[PDB]
Every structure is written in structure tokens, then in C-alpha cells.
């Protein structure tokens, strides 16, 4: 009231429109749109054993849709990696890896800088970012 | 993959059925019913700036209903106190939540609700926040506990 | 800056002088002295796998000394309970820690040490660890509280 | 009772001997050596308001030594960044920490130290604190990771 979490990032540029999904109990699924860059980014979180759709950050862009369906609570994200009209940095590519050894991605275009967040202990419990159009910047909330 | 929180309590007895609302961003409202003990207990949580109603832990008992509306996020609980002990109207012979009192950082006292008999319990919080309630409910609130986060 | 933890309590009075050991990795040992109240109270903490004696909060009252040696990391506290109230030997009628009891996840009970008189307090821990103690000491233990972490 | 923290990383390779300082209250000072890669890496932590030197991870290499003195508690790290990659001076193409840069909430930049060659890595902290370091050291700093807390 209001509880807080460890927040890392963002990786990308000053948008665009800033958004913060806040924090939850975990992640059950993630949905993205990809081609040149990452367009749409949405999350279906876990909230105390139930699914909870996070606010939509959709891009209208004609990009391919992907669905990352984790075996929650047995399977979780151990890493978020990727690449970062306007010369402002945007999210070009995203990769996600799990504790069970499954690699989802790379999606988009691996160009420009590069970012990597390996997680040894803890969990991603929420996403933060900037969506114009497309995904400009992305960040994570962490908790034990 | 399920995030966890510090969990303290429960205060009360092993009767009824165990429930756990889980954890959220904070507390907006507490609704309870009382008479000589605590009946119903339901919470409206904050979940990332929006109201999120927790599961209801309703009692069919003809008790008086009360709404504890906190001025979230400026105002939050700094203590949860009360009394637990057997209740003579029975048929449960194990302790039950007889009374509850909530105090905030703004200096507001809510309660006592119920009947102040049995063993007193007090959780003063010096640093951190209640983010969820856990308990046991039968015909009454048998036990109560809390999740804490920073 | 300075990292923080969840802090609960204190239980007891406002007498003596306030102290806070701060927070560490866990608890290895608790040393206390008792008779009709709690006198001395010192802790040997874990700090990243090494022992770290915290500050001493010694009483010069000839009480019985006891060493609570916890089998760290397998063994940890699941509850701190006790009694607070004024003590016959004045010149202050402020409530003091009259008794303490410690229970572990391995079903070990340490105490009650002291005199089980006044107001009982109980902190059952369902999820999390005590990582530090805070309190107040004058001639004896006036108040006690804990830091908790995951 | 072993308390845990969020641990991110490591960044770098599998060479050297793995180490973990564990977690503390905060960071007071960072001592490192550098030339074409990072050599030595030693931290002075804060432990409940007092300085606590962690274990040394000293490189035998004739490198340039530097002290990053942080104005704890008001000044703390908001960023750790650098470069990771193979080093031509080595018999193995195992990636090592080539460069390090540290940024504080007070707008102070420390570095870049070393060679800005290989794979760039960046850890911005929007909320929370670095409370400990973990890594791998042989002749050089092969890997680096961080413990985080609120
Ligand atoms: Cl291309
Ligand atoms: Cl390419
Ligand atoms: Cl007496
Ligand atoms: Cl007696
Ligand atoms: Cl007696
Ligand atoms: Cl007596």
C-alpha cells in the first residue's frame, strides 16, 4: 500500500508512451508481434494461482504473432535478452529462455546494441516499457 | 515461478477451512461482520493502482456488517490486533477470532469489532506493508494471518 | 543507500535505551539471562556463511544464563513468543519483557525463560526468516522486535 | 536460516574460480585493477552502518589500481555496465570482463575502466539496491554478477 519491487532497465529509448503493468505473482504466457522490430507486447500474468491479462500494448503494424506458453509454476523465465522514422532507440529484437531449457526467440531483427538479463535467483513478476506503434523500451520487475 | 511473500500468523484456531487471498499491491478496504466474534471477512485490495476484490469469506450468521475504507495509498495499516479464544455458543471447541482492531499511520483506529475475550494478539508493523490476508473460516473467522512486503 | 527489511514489533515498554542489531543472513545462536524477567540478550548471526556476533545487550543482574544454539542453516526460528508487563522491582512501572519462548522448524522449544506474567505476545512465522533483532535495554530487556526477510 | 536476494547475471565467461561475497546493507567502496581487461575486484560493503570489507579478488597482473569511493548512504549505484569478450593476451578464447563503468544517483560516472571491446552489457536500476557482488576470478575478472534488495 503501495508495495514496491526491484525494477531493472529500461532497455530502449525515450518514446513514445510510457507504461508500467505493475507487479504480480508470475508469468503464465507472453504474446508479441515481430518482423523488423518488436511491435506488440502483452502479458497474461499469474495472480495468486489465476490468469490475469495485463494492459494491452498493441502495435497495428502487419507483424507475425507469437505465443509463449509456460508450464506455470514448474517453468519460468531465467533470461530476457534482445537488441536496442525517428533516430530514437527502439526494441529491435527479443529472446526469452526458461529453467526447463526452452528457448523462445530470437524475434525481430538482431541489430544495434544488445542487452542481456540472466536471472540466477528470483522471478520476473511484471513488465514496464514504452509503446508508440511499436515497442520502444522494455524493463522488468523482480521479486523472490 | 510463483512469487512469495513473508507470511506471519495465523492467530486463532485450526477449525473451519483454510483460505489464502494471496498477495497484491496493498489494501484499500476491509469488510467484516461481528457480534460476540468475527463472522465475515472480505478484502478489497489494491492491484497496481486499481481496486481488486479478493475472494469473499462470508458468514451466514446474523451479524453487523462494517466497511473499513482506507485512504490508499497515503493511509495504510500499522497494526492488526485482537482476541482469540473459544466461543461458548459453539459447537467448535477450538479458538476462534473473537475481536479485531486495525490502526493506521494516519492515527485512525477501527474497532474493537466483536468481543474482547480470550488471548490478546498484536502485530505492530514498524517497516513494511500488509499485502494480503490468509485465514480460516467456518461459520466464523477461526484464524487470521498476513502477507508482508516492502 | 541502506537496504531495508520488514520490521515487526516491538513488544514491551518504552523504558531503557533503544538498540537495533540491524539485518544479517540468519541466526546461529541466542544468549539470554532470566529469572523473574529477561535480563541479557545477545545474538550470534550468520553473515554469508560465517558467524558474526552482534552487539551485546548485557544485564548485570545475576540471572540464569542460557545458550540457544540453532542448527543453522537446516534449523531456524518459526516463532517468537513471550510475556510483557510491569515488574515488581521498580523504580519504573513501564512494561518490560517478562518471558521469552523460541520455537524452531525442527520442533525444538527453547523456553519459556523468565516469568509468564502480564500480556502474552506471539509472532508465528509461516514464510520467511528472522534476520535481525531490535529492542530496548536498561537494567534488563524492556522491549523486543524483529527484522524479517525471505 | 539462509536469507536470499535477487541475483542477476553473471556477465562474462566460465574461466577463473567462482566467488560470492554474499549480501550486505549497501556499498561503500569498490577497488579494482585494469589495463586491457579488469584484474582485481574488491568491495567495502556497508553492514548495518559500519564498513565491512568483503573477500579480496586480487589479480597478480601489473595493472592500474583505482578506488571508487561512494558517499554512502546518500550516494549509491544506479548502473553497472561494461564489455565482455575474449582477450588476445590469453591462451583461451573464454570471455572475460574487459571493461567496467559505474554510475551513481548523484550523477557521478566512474570509468570506463579497461578496454571497451567485445559484447556490451548494461544493468540500469530504476528501483532497488546492489547489496553484494558475485563473480569469477583467475588471472583476471572473468565474470561479474549482482545481488539486489530494496
Ligand atoms: Cl535486415
Ligand atoms: Cl542480421
Ligand atoms: Cl512478580
Ligand atoms: Cl512467580
Ligand atoms: Cl508461577
Ligand atoms: Cl504470577
In chain A, what are the domains? 1-144 (2.100.10.30)
Obtained via which technique? X-ray
Q: Do D74 and C46 touch (CB under 8 A)?
A: no
Q: Do B10 and C126 touch (CB under 8 A)?
A: yes
Ligand nearest the Cα atom of residue C86: 3
Ligand nearest the Cα atom of residue C37: 3
What residues of chain B lie within 8 A of the CB of A27, using their CB? Answer: 1
C-alpha cell at C104: 524452531
B36, β-bridge pairs: none
What residues of chain D lie within 8 A of the CB of A10, using their CB? Answer: 124, 126
In Å, what resolution does this model reach?
Answer: 2.1
CA-CA distance, A4 to B24, in Å (whole number)? 10
CA-CA distance, C130 to D109, in Å (whole number)? 37
Nearest Cα residue to D77 out of D22, D29, D10: D29
CA distance A41 to chain B (A): 18
Ligand nearest the Cα atom of residue A83: 2
Q: Do D25 and C2 touch (CB under 8 A)?
A: yes
Contact criterion met (CB below 8 Å) for D97 and D82: yes
Kindly write down the DSSP assignment for every residue of chain C, as one continuous string: -----EEEEEEE-S-SEEEE----SEEEEEEEEESSSEEEEEEEEEETTEEEE-------S--EEEEEE--TTT--EEEEEEEEE--SS-S--S-EEEEEEEEETTS-EEEEEE---SEEEEEEEEE-EEEEEEEEESSSEEEEEEEEE-
How would you list the strands of the sheet with B129-137, edge to edge?
A: B17-20, B129-137, B141-149, B6-12, C119-127, C77-85, C96-104, C109-114
What residues of chain B lie within 8 A of the CB of A46, using their CB? Answer: 1-2
Instruction: Give the burial class of C43: count Cβ atoms within 10 A of its Cβ; 0-12 exposed, 13-18 middle, 19 or more buried.
Output: buried
C-alpha cell at D86: 575474449
CA distance A51 to chain B (A): 12
Percent helix, strand and coil across chain A, each rounded to 5?
A: 0, 60, 40
Contact criterion met (CB below 8 Å) for C84 and C121: yes
- C1, C22, C25 member nearest D22 (Cβ): C25
Chains that touch D (3 or more CB pairs under 8 A): A, C
Q: Choose the mutation target among C79, C81, C122, C144 for the interface with B, i.e. most B CBs under 10 Å.
A: C122
What residues of chain A lie within 8 A of the CB of B77, using their CB? Answer: 1
Distance of CA A113 from the midpoint of ligand 1 (Å): 15
CA-CA distance, B62 to B14, in Å (whole number)? 23
CA-CA distance, C77 to C113, in Å (whole number)? 16
Residue of C nearest to D147 (CA): C3
Which residues, including other chains, have CB under 8 Å from residue D70's CB and lie 6 or more apart? D27, D28, D29, D30, D76, D77, D104
CA-CA distance, A137 to A116, in Å (whole number)? 14
The DSSP letter of residue D140 is S
Nearest Cα residue to A108 out of A36, A13, A30, A41: A36
Q: Which residue has the cell 543482574?
A: C61
**SS3 of A24, please?**
coil
Kindly write down the DSSP assignment for every residue of D25-82, as one continuous string: SEEEEEEEEESSSEEEEEEEEEETTEEEE-------S-PEEEEEE--TTT--EEEEEE
Chain C residues with CB under 8 Å of a chain D CB are 1-4, 20-27, 46-49, 70, 72-73, 75-77, 129-131, 149-150
Amino acid at each position: 500500500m503501495a508495495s514496491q519491487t526491484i525494477t531493472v532497465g529500461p532497455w530502449g529509448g525515450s518514446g513514445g508512451n510510457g507504461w508500467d503493468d505493475g507487479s504480480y505473482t508470475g508469468i503464465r504466457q507472453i504474446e508479441l508481434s515481430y518482423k523488423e522490430a518488436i511491435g506488440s507486447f502483452c502479458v497474461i500474468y499469474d495472480l495468486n494461482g489465476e490468469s490475469f491479462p495485463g494492459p494491452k500494448h498493441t502495435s497495428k503494424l502487419p507483424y507475425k504473432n507469437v505465443k509463449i506458453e509456460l508450464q506455470f509454476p514448474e517453468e519460468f523465465l531465467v533470461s530476457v535478452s534482445g537488441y536496442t522514422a525517428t533516430p530514437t532507440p527502439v526494441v529491435r529484437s527479443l529472446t526469452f529462455k526458461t529453467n526447463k531449457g526452452r528457448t523462445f526467440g530470437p524475434y525481430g531483427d538482431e541489430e544495434g546494441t544488445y542487452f542481456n538479463l540472466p536471472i540466477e535467483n528470483g522471478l520476473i513478476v511484471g513488465f514496464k516499457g514504452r509503446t508508440g506503434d511499436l515497442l520502444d523500451a522494455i524493463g522488468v520487475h523482480m521479486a523472490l
